[PDB]
Amino acid sequence: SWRDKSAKVQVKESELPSSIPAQTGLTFNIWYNKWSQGFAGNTRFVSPFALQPQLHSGKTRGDNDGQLFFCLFFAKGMCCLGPKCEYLHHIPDEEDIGKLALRTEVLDCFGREKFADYRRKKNKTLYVGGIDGALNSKHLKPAQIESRIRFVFSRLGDIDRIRYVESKNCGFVKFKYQANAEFAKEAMSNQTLLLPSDKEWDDRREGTGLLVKWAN
Ligand SMILES: [Zn+2]
């Protein structure tokens, strides 16, 4: 259990671009967009960092300091603080979500303004696009592709239903809880769908990262 270990450091500070911003801060998007644009290709970059929930999740100072919000850098595999982090480093669970419900209805699980409030039904469904590209056009059949989407998303929260739609090169992932959809959107954006066992793994950065958006 994540409760029985310290959160792992995911990256060294020196691997990240300077002027590291606060996750809820004024400049986060300027900084992150600049980061993204530094990568080659015209299509969405494939992030060199990734959350590995089992390996990475653990206690942080946030767990002991009354923190209710989750670490955005953690979700993206790029928190350099590990157990020093004042935000949470685990996958949101029912208990966390209950506490968040009492605390706010305008902020997401990361402490940012909710998407719905700047453009009653809580949206818990994500559109996942660019699947073929995130596999470097590997020849997989639908059963295999579905298994991969299910695997990576199910480790980010309780899944209500998942659908892979071959004709549209996309998937739809509906979570039981909005908090997990919020978390998973940040975790999976720009990710590869390749696995270490794939012949293509070493060349994963030549793909195009997953497109993950709120579904209609
Ligand atoms: Zn963190």
Curated annotation (Swiss-Prot):
**From which domain of life does this come?**
Eukaryota
Q: Where in the cell is it found?
A: Nucleus
**Keywords attached to this entry:** Cell cycle, Metal-binding, mRNA processing, mRNA splicing, Nucleus, Phosphoprotein, RNA-binding, Spliceosome, Zinc, Zinc-finger
Q: Which GO terms describe its molecular function?
A: pre-mRNA binding; U6 snRNA binding; zinc ion binding
UniProt domain RRM: residue ranges: 124-216
**Consequence recorded when altering residue 175 to D:** Inhibits cell growth
Q: What is its main location?
A: nucleus
A biological process from GO: mRNA cis splicing, via spliceosome
**Effect the entry attributes to changing residue 71 to Y:** Inhibits cell growth
The effect of residue 85 to H is: Inhibits cell growth
**Which intervals hold the zinc fingers (C3H1-type)?**
65-92
Query: What Gene Ontology cellular-component terms does the record carry?
Result: Prp19 complex; U2-type catalytic step 1 spliceosome; U2-type catalytic step 2 spliceosome
Function of the molecule: Involved in the first step of pre-mRNA splicing. Required for cell growth and cell cycle control. Plays a role in the levels of the U1, U4, U5 and U6 snRNAs and the maintenance of the U4/U6 snRNA complex. May provide the link between the 'nineteen complex' NTC spliceosome protein complex and the spliceosome through the U6 snRNA. Associates predominantly with U6 snRNAs in assembled active spliceosomes. Binds directly to the internal stem-loop (ISL) domain of the U6 snRNA and to the pre-mRNA intron near the 5' splice site during the activation and catalytic phases of the spliceosome cycle.
Question: What does the further note read?
Answer: Present with 2650 molecules/cell in log phase SD medium.
Domain remark text: The C-terminal RRM domain and the zinc finger motif are necessary for RNA-binding.
Oligomeric form and interacting partners = Belongs to the CWC complex (or CEF1-associated complex), a spliceosome subcomplex composed of the U2, U5 and U6 snRNAs and at least BUD13, BUD31, BRR2, CDC40, CEF1, CLF1, CUS1, CWC2, CWC15, CWC21, CWC22, CWC23, CWC24, CWC25, CWC27, ECM2, HSH155, IST3, ISY1, LEA1, MSL1, NTC20, PRP8, PRP9, PRP11, PRP19, PRP21, PRP22, PRP45, PRP46, SLU7, SMB1, SMD1, SMD2, SMD3, SMX2, SMX3, SNT309, SNU114, SPP2, SYF1, SYF2, RSE1 and YJU2. Interacts with ISY1. Interacts with PRP19.
Q: What protein family does this chain belong to?
A: Belongs to the RRM CWC2 family.
Listed name of the protein: Pre-mRNA-splicing factor CWC2
Q: Which organism is it from?
A: Saccharomyces cerevisiae (strain ATCC 204508 / S288c) (Baker's yeast)
Taxonomy of origin reads: Eukaryota, Fungi, Dikarya, Ascomycota, Saccharomycotina
Q: Which portion of the entire protein is included?
A: 3 to 227 of 339
